[PDB]
Structures are given as C-alpha cells and as structure tokens.
Amino acid sequence: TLRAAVFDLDGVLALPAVFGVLGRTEEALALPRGLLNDAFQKGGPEGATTRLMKGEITLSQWIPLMEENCRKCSETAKNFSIKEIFDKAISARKINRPMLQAALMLRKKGFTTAILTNTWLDDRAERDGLAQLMCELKMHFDFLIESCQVGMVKPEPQIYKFLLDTLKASPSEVVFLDDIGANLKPARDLGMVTILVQDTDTALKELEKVTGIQLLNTPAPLPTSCNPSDMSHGYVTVKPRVRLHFVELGSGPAVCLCHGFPESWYSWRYQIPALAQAGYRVLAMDMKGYGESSAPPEIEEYCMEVLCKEMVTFLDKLGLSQAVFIGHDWGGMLVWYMALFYPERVRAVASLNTPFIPANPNMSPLESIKANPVFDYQLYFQEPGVAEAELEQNLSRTFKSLFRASDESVLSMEAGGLFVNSPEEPSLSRMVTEEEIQFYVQQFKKSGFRGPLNWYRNMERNWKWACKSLGRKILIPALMVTAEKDFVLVPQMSQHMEDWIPHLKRGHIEDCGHWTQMDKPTEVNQILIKWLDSDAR
Amino acid sequence: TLRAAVFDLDGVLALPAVFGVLGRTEEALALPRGLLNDAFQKGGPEGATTRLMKGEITLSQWIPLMEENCRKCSETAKNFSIKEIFDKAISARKINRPMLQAALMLRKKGFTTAILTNTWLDDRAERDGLAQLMCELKMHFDFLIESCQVGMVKPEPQIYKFLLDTLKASPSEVVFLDDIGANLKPARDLGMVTILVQDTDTALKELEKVTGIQLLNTPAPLPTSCNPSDMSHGYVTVKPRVRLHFVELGSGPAVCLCHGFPESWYSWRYQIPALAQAGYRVLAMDMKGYGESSAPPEIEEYCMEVLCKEMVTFLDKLGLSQAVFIGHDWGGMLVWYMALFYPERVRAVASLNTPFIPANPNMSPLESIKANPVFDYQLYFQEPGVAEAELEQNLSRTFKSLFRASDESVLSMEAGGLFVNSPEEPSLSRMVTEEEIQFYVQQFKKSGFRGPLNWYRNMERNWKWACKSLGRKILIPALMVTAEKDFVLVPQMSQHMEDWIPHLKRGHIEDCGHWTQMDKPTEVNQILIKWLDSDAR
C-alpha cells in the first residue's frame, strides 16, 4: 500500500518543461532538428550538463561550455544567445497548479511527499525568479532533493536509493512521477509505482487510480493556512509595561493586519501566506490585550488614542516609516483612526466589515447605542468582571459558540449573558477544525478577557478624541469590504462613507458572516491582493 | 541650572525653512514681495493655516484653501501650483546635522531633549518623505510635541505650559531654540532661556555659552548604536530543537548580518541603525550557539553544511527568497559558503576580515594549521571542555581581554591557555563601555562557550564539504573588506581571491584590528552603504 509520492520539477510540478523550449527555439530559428537538444546533452555522463546538474559548476560557468557545444554541433551538421534562450525558458516556467493541488491532497491524506529534481546552482543576475518559484513549491512538501546539492543525478541508481533512505520507505510504498522515461526506468526497476507524465489530466487519472484518492475534479481547496510553530514571531516593547507580538512573513511593502474581538493574529491564517506570496511583508499583530502581547488591566490602556499611539511606536521601533493597515471589527475601527490621526504613517487603509461613521458631537455614544438594539451586548460588556466571568468559564464553548457561519447561529442577542439558551457543548462549525479552536483556547489562557473587553470600555474617551477629527476627510487610498450576512456590522452601515472618504474603493462578499477571514478566505485574498496591487504598490 | 533643551523643527532641526522658500518663489515668479507669505498666514488665528496646524484639517484639505487665499491677495495687490511649490519645499528640507549633533551631545550629558513644532497631518501622495524625516529625527529626542496632535499652536501660551508639564521642569531649567521671534516670545515671558536661530554656528555658540557644554567644533561622533530593549526581536524555529533569534530594523532589501566568534547580534550595533537609515531591512542574527539562539551540545550541529542549511531554512520561514549576506570572522566564512552552495538565495555577499581561500584537497586542514603559527589557538580549541573552562571562568575578564584595539593587546598567542600572563582585571578598552561588556557577559551566561567553540570542531567535515565546490567560482556581487591591523586574518591572506571571485569589489580599513565593526564603525558603514547602493539595490 502506497504512503509516499515523489514528483519531478521540470515538466511535472513546473510547466513548460525544457526539451519543448529547445525544440521550439530550433523551429523558431529554423535550425536543424534536435541541434540544441543535442548540444545540451553533449558528452552524456561526462559532459558539461552532467557537471552542472551534479553541482560541480554553476549555471554562469555552464553558459560558455553550452555555447562551445552548440558551435561543435552546428559544425558537424554543416544574434543567437544561450543566455537569452535559457533566461526566457526559466522565466516562462510556472507552477503546474493542478499537479501541486494533487500533491497537497495526498499530503493532507497522510502521504509523505517529495520533490526529486535534476537542477543547478543558479548564479545568474536573474536567479531570484527561480528562487521565488522553489520557495513557493518546497513549503508544500516533506522533502526537496536537488541533484546539485546531493552530487548525484537521475538516472544514476544511487539517487533512488538516497530517495528511499530519505523517505524511510520500501520501493513498493512509493509513487514516482516523472516526464522523462529514462529517469522513470530506475524507480520502476526498484519496484516503485511510476507515472510517465505527458499531459497533467492523464497523469492525475493514473495517480488517482493507484492511490484510491480523488485528485482530479475535486472541490476548490482552501488557501494555504499557517502552522504557528513554523512562523517567525516578533516582539517589540512599545513602553515599559507593554510589548506587542506579531507574526511576520514575506518581503515588500509592510502590511499590518489588525484583528478584532475576541480574536488573534491567527484569525489572518489564510491571508498571511497569500499576501506574502503576492509580494508583501505581512505583520499580523496580536492586538494589545491578546495572545503574546501585553494585557495591562487598566481600562484607559485600551482607548483608541493610546492604541493608535502604540501602533505608531511599533512602526518607529521596527524602523518602518509607513505600513498599509488592514483591520477587521475592532481592528477595522483602529485602522480608520490611524488614517485620520497618522496619515503620514499609513500607506493605505482597508477595513473588513467595520464602517467609518464619524462621531455625532450632539449624541453620547451610549445614546447612539440606545437607537440600535443590535449593539445591546456593548452595554453588557461595560461592567468590569461580568462578561469576563461568562467568557472565561469555558473557553472551548466560548470560541465554538462564536466562530460560526451565517446559517450556524447558536447565540441570541433581558436577564442574560451571551450564552443563555446556548448549548454547553456546541457542534464544531464547518469554518473551523477542533485544532484551530484549541489554538484560540490556548491563547486566551494567558490573559483572559479583561484586556479584550476593555476595548469596549472607552466609549466616552473615544468619542471625545474622535470629535477632534470632524473637520477632516480620509484622502489616502482606502478600501471598505462589506459582508452580506454580518448581522451587526451590516453592509448598510457603510452607505454614507463616500461623504468622508471620497476616493473610497469597495469590495463585497456574499453569503459571508462576521468572521470574514475564515468564512470566505479565497474571496478576501482576491479582494485584498487586487486592491494592494493597484493602490498600495 | 539648565537640564532641558527644546528645539523647533522648521529652520532649526531641518533646513531650508519655509518663510525663505515662499520668499524665493515670489522672487523666481517676479510676484509682489510677501504675496505668498501673506496668503500663507491669512486670517491669523482664525485662518486656514492655523486650522491646519491645530489638526482641524489635513494638508490636502488646506491646499485649495491656500489657493483661494493666494487669489484674494493678488486681487487686492492688483501654471502656478501651491501643491508643486509645497511638495518641492517639503522635499528639499533636510536634517540640520550640526543642530542634531548638539541635541545628541546635550542628551548624552543628561539633558532631557524635545522637539516642539507647528506641523500638519500630511495626507499627500508624497507624505512618506516627511514620515521618513520625522522618524529619523524623533528617535534622538525624549519627546516630540506636534501642534496638530495636541490641537495647540505656538505662539499660544497653553502649548508652553503643556511643554513644561511634559518636561516635568520649571521654565528656568529650559533652553528653547526657535527661528521665529514671535514663537520665542512666550517661552521668554515664562522665564525660559531662549535662542533666536538665524545661522546654526551662532545659535550653537549661544547654546554652548548657556549650557557650559562644548557643542561646536567637537570631535566626530560615533554612529548611532542600539539599545537592546528598544529593538524588535525575532525568533524562527529552523528545526525541532533549534531556534534562531535576530534583531530587525528598517525596510527595503533584506540584509542578513552574521557575527563571528565569540560575539553576538550586538557586535553590529553601530551598523544596524545606519543600514536601516540607508534603506535596507536589517536582520542581525544571534548565530547558532549564541545569545537567544539555540545551542545544542553536539559538535556535528556546527559544521558549515548544517549551519548554511539552517540559514536557508531561516530565509524559507521568514518568506524571503534572498537576502544580502554580510559576515565577520566565522560569520564571514559562513557567508562565502552561502554564496558557493546557495547562490540563488544570496542577493550579494560581503565579508569583513575573513578571506575566501579554497580548500586544498592535498592537505588536511590540520596540516594547513601546521604551516601557520598564528592559528595555533585553533588546536587548543579542539579538545571539548578545555577552552570552555578557561573562557567561562570569568566572563567580564574574557570579553575585556578580547575586545581591544590594535595598540591595546593584552593576550599572547606551549603550557598555556589564552589568558596566561594576562591581567585578571584588564583595563576597559577605548572601543567599549562597561555597559557593553556586561551585555556580552549577560548573553554568554545562558549557553556558555560550547556551541561557539564547536564552530572550530568541524575541520575535517568542513574541508570535505568545501572540496565539492572546487570547480565553482563566486560570480554573484561580492565585497572583501580587509583590516590593516588584524594580526590573524591579515589583509595579505585575501591576495588571491580574484582567481575565484573575478568581479570582487574591495574595501580596506587602516589602523583597524580584528573587531572591525566596533573598531572603525563610521568607515565600515561608509564602505557597506556605498557597496549595497551600487551592487545590492
């Protein structure tokens, strides 16, 4: 029974291959057939290409050797640049998405996966393109075995025995996928299941047949998530008693993700890998009062003025002049105030669900709550200790009750608490795994709900501070993303935003409840990436 | 007696001012004298500019109001763009270096320093320039008081009382420097020492006279250093038992700094702020075996092959496709091997002191040590436990004996140890403060010298691995920096590097011992920044 799957890179995980490119170049330049493909493999196991693939020489050293081989082949058969041909061939090669999806599904099902490839040490001025491709791919596999790193090459028998040793599996337990028949032969001779890959669909049909796992025509997979233990964790002291923790991934313009109540940096798990892959340096915060960030007990530590000042200090200490700020819920509220009070530090602003509504100077925030019954829970959150006790009573119940899709409601909104007439053992929502709920449970064991609830206990202070901004407009790039089925932060609440943000851009997500990021991650990523690429680059 | 110094921004800490720019624009456009300067201050305390400076409106909202004021002034006096004029005026404004140097010296001497300024909420598309200027300046002061953040403006009396409250000082204890006489008047009326700033030299002469501290014509100051508690600290698990710690500062291309033996990320303290200010994202490592990084006890955990693999994993986990790698001593050795084995992940490579010398396959690394008496200490480091015992005996003595300039040698290089005939209480070198030695002492209390010494215990393994690279050349951008007075890693050892690195660039530092970064920080920064800007951008 199979338990390991091995994939080649050129022609399997990445397309178009290379035998085809040399073939197309020959046709485009009207050269004798196979002239370039022949110069490429000249000398076989003793030739320049084998030395390149074994890591004896780098790609830049191989270029002049390949040119000499091309000259010899043209001489025998009786503006051209090998550098330009190979630069263009490497650049055009893209990840074979359905092949990657099949490898992802096999790993999800318990398979050990590996990439086994004949590759080179790339020292060209344009090597970063290849570095980026390898980085994106390798993160999805258990092992990456490169010929130039092991000093062995397919079809040599040693690399297969080395592959087996690495997998800690007998040959009958391994499926081996390759586009080159000669490279497939030794794995077959060892007893491995082999697949000659010509077109992806047929290769995947063969793969599905031998594994007994559906891989072709399967549903749209969720975006890549985050394994907390595999992330880079950052810590900045913003003042003597306050440190902020963040997870960091990627390079490019800084993008600061600000979660809501009662969440975590982990609420952005489906966005962090996507945004980093899109070319941004993501900084996903644990907001003040949460997870590994400090949680001072004082109510005044959580007013918007102090939270914004600390986020400015956070940028100062990291040496960042600006970041794009993207917030959800209370984090969305914080991002609009960052745009209003610190525009010079905000490259662009985006909010999920949270609208920008200016303070009414003729109405107390309490009177404004009066007008709307959907915000009654905010009054319940006022008295220190009351909501903490109910929310801390059973963490698994708190999170399982909260984190549900629009059609999974288990909570109602006197004589109460959030959990009146709510199950003691709620069923697990289709949005989350038990493992994910337990991550939030574990995060909230450190400081509980006091800091998070204090974000609601500064209504009067926040209102007074917000009134100082009444004559201003948000004129930096801005995005408002509404969620059709958020029954508290309704899309309708954002209807007048253009009055204060005239150049505002929008996104809208149908069939999406309050927990936007985990409810509809693919759509959130699509919306944010499109907006970042047009407005924040 | 004075104990606080307050500086204005426009015309004091940053030049050229603004009254001069409007004056020059009037002359260049042959407009009536004072026309623009008059439209700028139109309405005085009730006008658009006061509203802008108090934070009632943003800069982008003020532009059309200023245009209407310019129209009214031209109308009364009987291709022009306010946006273009102000964009150019903001951009041309640069930090007044001697003024900043004087503020730095006063703070060093115990003075509380502050910037007090009439400024705006900048929401222009080009706001980042101003954000960068403010960031660079503010880090050097105890307080930054901005009119648009406090909703108060100079010359209003309230801002001065607010300034005093912030400083926690009586007016007679404060020196107040301003370029505007009207803004100086209320500080004088309160009893503060005031300086009208026209030309910097005269202002500094007045400042020197009143403080009794030499500020003008003083020696070249050291580059800005790092306060460990103020840095962003990052942590990446590269394998189950191994995590790497780093300090991170700045934005732009990733620059990974790799220290030597027996050092720390802190050995780069004078480079981190300079490189981040130059436009790079600095990642200063605690190398494996040091400080907050893991220090497994096994010798094999410290061979170059494993250390390089882990640095590749470090990049993978941070989501970086490449970084520039800059190393000193053992870190310099690691960076040449990163260039040789992982060129696709190395944007550029630079070494301080450590030359690139290819492995001699016909000589054992032990036989090669035989040939050179300067490397005898490496044999002493071989036997596990022996050098650890001597180096761990007294940490303060170890570091104070080691970290000295070329003319301060206290150690000799049988029947020994490093500290034979060496003082038990060495004097403090002119290169370091007691505080800095104690930082290294504190770092080495966690894991001691076993991990660091294990870097020397892989000679045979490193030699075997290095021989696989004998047919390669380093063809990515490279810099070799030699130090005239390093008596072990002599500049002469680098003489043949061009044979293997044909495009190699060089730097050379005279009167510089082994501890390059702290010996000659200004010169190191100059060399690295010049090279990064030409070869790594």
Ligand SMILES: Fc1cccc(-c2cc[nH]n2)c1
């Ligand atoms: F003022 C705000 C702004 C955004 C979200 C909330 C909120 C209250 C409960 N969940 N989210 C409150």
Ligand SMILES: Fc1cccc(-c2cc[nH]n2)c1
């Ligand atoms: F989502 C939002 C946006 C703005 C204000 C509020 C608000 C006012 C009182 N409670 N919450 C909620």
Ligand SMILES: Fc1cccc(-c2cc[nH]n2)c1
């Ligand atoms: F192999 C190397 C390379 C660079 C520095 C050293 C070394 C030995 C003592 N200090 N530094 C050894």
Ligand SMILES: Fc1cccc(-c2cc[nH]n2)c1
């Ligand atoms: F600085 C260097 C550079 C290269 C090799 C060595 C070496 C060889 C034996 N011990 N150290 C030192």
